[PDB]
Amino acid sequence: AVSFIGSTENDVGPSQGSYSLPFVYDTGYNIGYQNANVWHISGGFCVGLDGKVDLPVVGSLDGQSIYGLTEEVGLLIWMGDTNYSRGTAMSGNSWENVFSGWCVGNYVSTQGLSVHVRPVILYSVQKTSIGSIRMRPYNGSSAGSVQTTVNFSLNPFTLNDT
Ligand SMILES: CC(=O)N[C@@H]1[C@@H](O)[C@H](O)[C@@H](CO)O[C@H]1O
């Protein structure tokens, strides 16, 4: 069994927030969103995760896409399971597997996710739509007609440059 228990729209990173080429502001996992309970799963239900970044790919760095916000600022993006360190560097604008998934036993548990980004200097940024994450039922399991996708928006912030 499965049911949706999270929020549809989700803000990424704390509002306002101030931070001090291309240069990568290493903010760790601070500019992100994390929720371990987005879905309610039970009875051998198997689920994984797919991620999608809608921002334009303005470049590539060490393998992952540099998504653009402004002609001056860009982002590196990670999506995946609940724990931050278990993310997947995002590349492109297509649905990608960001978490291979698991299967809950004969009991009640949940499926979460996490998302974090890092500023990239190519200042201030206005809140912008980032992308989405969808649960991926498998091994026979199906989403039925329960909400499968959630979205993410980056809260405005500023980079105290040099
Ligand atoms: C701890 C919790 O509430 N449920 C977690 C869920 O967030 C996570 O997505 C899943 C797969 O790793 O493992 C569950 O145990």
- The 8-class DSSP code of residue 42 comes to -
Question: What is the spatial distance between Cα 136 and Cα 14, in angstroms, rounded to a whole number?
Answer: 28
Question: What is the spatial distance between Cα 61 and Cα 63, in angstroms, rounded to a whole number?
Answer: 5
In the reported structure, the alpha carbon of residue 39 is separated from the centroid of ligand 1 by a whole-number distance in angstroms of 9
Architecture of the domain made up of 1-162: Sandwich (2.60)
Query: For residue 103, how many other CB atoms are within 10 A of its CB?
Result: 15
HSE-up of 110 (CA within 13 Å, CB side)?
11
Determine if ligand 1 sits within 6 Å of the CB of residue 35: no
> Which numbered atom of ligand 1 lies nearest the CA of 36?
7
Structure tokens at 73: 């600022």
In the reported structure, the alpha carbon of residue 145 is separated from the centroid of ligand 1 by a whole-number distance in angstroms of 22
Question: What is the spatial distance between Cα 21 and Cα 100, in angstroms, rounded to a whole number?
Answer: 34
Determine if ligand 1 sits within 6 Å of the CB of residue 50: no
Q: How was this structure determined?
A: X-ray
Determine if ligand 1 sits within 6 Å of the CB of residue 81: yes
Using CB atoms within 10 Å of the CB of residue 28, give its burial: 0 to 12 exposed, 13 to 18 middle, 19+ buried.
Answer: exposed
- The 8-class DSSP code of residue 84 comes to G
In the reported structure, the alpha carbon of residue 104 is separated from the centroid of ligand 1 by a whole-number distance in angstroms of 9
The bridge status of strand 109-121 relative to strand 149-154 is unpaired
Domain boundaries, the chain: 1-162
